[model samples]
Target: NIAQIEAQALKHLDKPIIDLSGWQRPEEINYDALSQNISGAIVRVHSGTTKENDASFINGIDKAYKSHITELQKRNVPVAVYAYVAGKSVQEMEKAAEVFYNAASPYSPSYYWLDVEDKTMSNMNEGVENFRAKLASLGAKNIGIYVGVYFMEEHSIDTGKFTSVWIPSYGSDSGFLESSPKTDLDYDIHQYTSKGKIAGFDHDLDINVISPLKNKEETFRKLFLKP
Candidate 1:
């Protein structure tokens, strides 16, 4: 069903397209699985979700990274990982993100995202840029700077060098925050919710509308995608 949305988006316009699962997190495969089938993944990893050494944080990411390898083995796909931060503040999340990014791994995430739609996490322009610079030092590009319709106006932020923007303008036909779109705005993906089935875990799931500009072929050649 979500693929159908991507196909529809392709018809609507010719531009880069990406899918975000957090808005309508599909129940079956989670973020990693979604990216495995498709290309490029947007996943949620929170430092404050649990203790710093929580198995879920490190292990969950480990599991997702392994999924990328698994998919790469099966077929040719380029999986870019996006670390989504929610509960923690800009300062706390900055330190936490550094720890996560520095930890060595065979698989490196192509991107890092800070989901700042939540009211508590608002007013984070400085931290967002600082976070990007920190992650850039760690070799993570294709940065995803996530914001919603209300949060941007409230924060009055100018998203600079984010590589792409993930907007949660739910139900907005245009999917733009407002009538004004900027040059830095990539508007890669929109978080429109829908119902669908995923292939990994049990239970039903909600799907997000994704648009893929190109398959993982290029992402593969650039990343660990070659034979």
Candidate 2:
């Protein structure tokens, strides 16, 4: 019976890893249920220095970041950190990276990622590089970026500097994978849905799956596992 159960569970091996911001309400999240699936967590370290609210964070650090990380760690769930790139100038971007790196480094996240959803500067490429450079100077080892393929092209943002690229291509964004991502660039993670349901949280959770095109086991190990 145990062997049969294990075989059945293997069918769901593609279970998602999670991404959380302060908006996810980590305070009410049940880490026990969240970690039951052995799902890893990506925590937002800071909203940005220029933002007034999540775009309500009057400071550099995210109010719920520390709490989410602490709870997840207690459950032995692997964790990484990401920052939404909100700076509009080269100067702002560089400084934003410094603040982002400093805040996340202490937690020693498995990886660091810059989220590029909007064009904040005229020269988007330069601004993105400055942010990456600032993190490198501070000794961040595993750096990545979460961006849309089309957005990267329109902005001409070079994806070369970071360790990996994470693409968000929800086929229908229908809380499940109705279609695979369409991208010319090779990517490491696919954030397929922002409307996925999970136990212990009332709100829709951001869910991601490792690229099926790659060595899924190996990639998950690299992305989330750390001593």
Candidate 3:
């Protein structure tokens, strides 16, 4: 079944992966999805600046992000973590980065991504840069950005330095190739569908694929498991 599902993925993508958040708390998550050739997971670790705002950090409502990582890793699924950026200024961004780093660092995520989608945040470029600097100061080396395609087009997101760029251009026919961003920046991951139903999940979940990284396993180990 995994071979068949993986072969089916070839009809649309080269290396399919999955991204999960607090919303995707399946009753029982196991190798079913992984066996389907799902490469790995990028889970939401933290968001906002405080506990009142960081829903994923709090236990309940859904599985804590740390638990998500532990379960996935126990099954040998490589993991990445992301934090939604709520900072509206350099100072706020710095605080956000500190919060993000503290929550995500212990897991040693394969990649640490900043989720920048707060349209209210003015001069986001500077904020993003500041966030990156702060995170680097905290010793997070592999930093990435999880932003929508239009955000990059609108804000002119400076993706030249990020280790990876994750885009959400949902609604593709094959569940992975809808509205491709017309940018020179090569996207490493693409979230094709947010309404997809998979084998182990009871509800619809986001489906993604590895686009830029050709040798995904090598890269995953080098960045996540390597010393």
Candidate 4:
């Protein structure tokens, strides 16, 4: 009886969450293995308008996004969608946000995260704000932003309006955390490693921890729980 009980407990064990982009070819993934390892999966929705420097029609859509989402959902992993921010000005940012939202809006991801890494816009703060409002106007409820502490400050972008903030501060790129981000900003998630090795994929993957603040489990559940 104890053995049976222990096995069932193991079945409910917690695991790391992961984020993937077009770079991680879906063909290189084993959904069965991946689903068993990660608590949830966040995939990129847009390739960043300007980064589409070459060609491809679907309005900055990341080609691998659909396959990644479909497979993860099929395996019962909660899915989140993120778009890399890019544009020359506020108007361009609004347009990019429209394209980004429309592409992933159908699936209604658990969280819509704005990946604000690019500094292409003249007024980065306004660009990010408009992008967030545009998504809100289009019916996105639970939104989040992923940005570094220094970058957020440098651009004068405020993460206060979004539902959540995710920070990336990897110390040595190891699969473990050396330290948390230096800033005191209120962030829910910390993507501590990009060189994660898991059974599901061969190449390095981005791994996330709940930032383990006082909120801890409270934050993780908020991101994964459905209405």
Candidate 5:
């Protein structure tokens, strides 16, 4: 069923992978079941409601990652831990992201994704840089941002450090192909799901965890750490 869907939607897909975030039940997710079926995944155990998302999500980070980390590892599967930070100040978001990074084993899920897609939201640059800085401190070498093309452009957030970008263009190639502003970065993953179907998941979601072209470990330590 998945292969058939992929073959049918091949042209619309920027890459051949998916990230399973908060909406899906972590318990219901069987990585072993999908290991042979899908390309990759981004699992978020510590996710919160947009503004109301609190530190409880932080607690779930470690528990969720630790529980699933070894499973993904055994299969040599690549998985990323996702967290929700509400604002942009680096100091403000550190504690939350720290709980996430420190919760999950440092060796697995190196990429920390900032989900930045809210029409009513006002802060952009502050939230992206701050959250990126927080994840950097936690030894996360590869950082990412998930947002629509219009949001990033309007906020003028610099996505240069992010290794992968989970873009929500929703069936429009124009955002992925043409809406790319001349920022110093490039997008690795394009999420083109209107109502994408991954087994056991009911709502539409974006699964865009692609392989990294260049590993940027030094970029994290140098830019994020204090001497």
Candidate 6:
């Protein structure tokens, strides 16, 4: 069932691809997946708030992100990045944005997404606004958000300001062929599964798709890749 969903999304959607973290290092990736019509990737740059509490999170960028960007771009596969957000105030989010921008700026990512899944912040909407503003201040134009459908419904996050929404919806443990999620605002991207497998990996990976194949490349390139 999930396989059918995956196949349908890959065949019909725009920019069907996968995302990676430190867990999916360069050595584990199968570049051939690119030729299989997987057009792009979103890599994790960082996770957590503090060094003492989130020491290994920065390794997401220092270790795996650059390598993935270099290799993925070598194959003409556009790459993006995301940071796990944990800030609860404007100042905290501003700092998070600074660290994220520093880590992501060099690559010129197609998109820089803030991962907001938990309720660690006081005002989710305000924190998002502050984070987005900080990124803009740092000269990042193509900023986006990655939040779960359930979390959005559960939290009071005002997601309207974002031009793009990257949603995660896993229907099964294997993250195979999950159903597409419905949103009030049209979502630009969907992470259907977290247990996806490819030829070069021993563990599962996250599967994603750009929905509504119409004008997909030109539109996204304008929003995410443009300088």
**Residue 64 lDDT (model 6):** 74
Q: Give lDDT: candidate 5, residue 83.
A: 67
**Runs of candidate 5 exceeding 4 Å displacement:** 1-15, 48-68, 88-90, 119-123, 172-185, 199-205, 209-227
Candidate 1 global TM-score? 0.57
Expressed as tens digits, the lDDT of each residue in 1-227 for candidate 6 is 43443343335345457788776757766765642556567888877523533224433333577777777766556678888887767887888888889988897787888888888776677777898889888998788888877778777677777767888877774757667776656778778898887655667778886666426765555433553
Ranking by lDDT: 4, 2, 6, 3, 5, 1
Q: How many backbone clashes does candidate 5 have?
A: 4
lDDT of 3 by residue, 1-227 (tens): 43442334343233456777777664445545653455667788665523543345442122467767887766555677887776767887888788778877787778888888866467777788888889989998888888887787788768777877887777554554676545556676667787766666666667776555446544544434432
Lowest-scoring 10 consecutive residues by lDDT in candidate 5?
A: 218-227
Clashes of each: 1, 1, 0, 0, 4, 1
Residue 33 in candidate 4 has what lDDT?
A: 89
> What lDDT does model 4 reach?
0.81
lDDT of each: 0.46, 0.80, 0.68, 0.81, 0.53, 0.71
Q: So what's the TM-score on candidate 5?
A: 0.64
Q: Which ranges of candidate 4 are over 4 A from the true structure?
A: 1-13, 49-58
Candidate 2 lands at a TM-score of: 0.89
lDDT of 3: 0.68
How would you encode candidate 5's per-residue C-alpha lDDT over 58-129 as one tens digit per residue?
Answer: 344423555455565455444566766554354556666676676654545646677766532356576667
Top candidate, metric TM-score: 2
Q: Any residue pairs clashing in model 5, and if so which?
A: 18-207, 19-207, 88-126, 88-127
Worst 10 residues of 2 by lDDT: 2-11
Q: Which regions in candidate 1 have their CA more than 4 angstroms from the true location? A: 1-40, 45-74, 86-91, 103-105, 119-122, 172-186, 198-227
Pairwise lDDT winner, candidates 2 and 6: 2
Per-residue lDDT of 60-138 in model 1, one digit per residue for the tens?
2433334433443233233344454543466666675675575422454445566665544554666566667776776
* Candidate with more favorable, higher TM-score: 4 or 5: 4
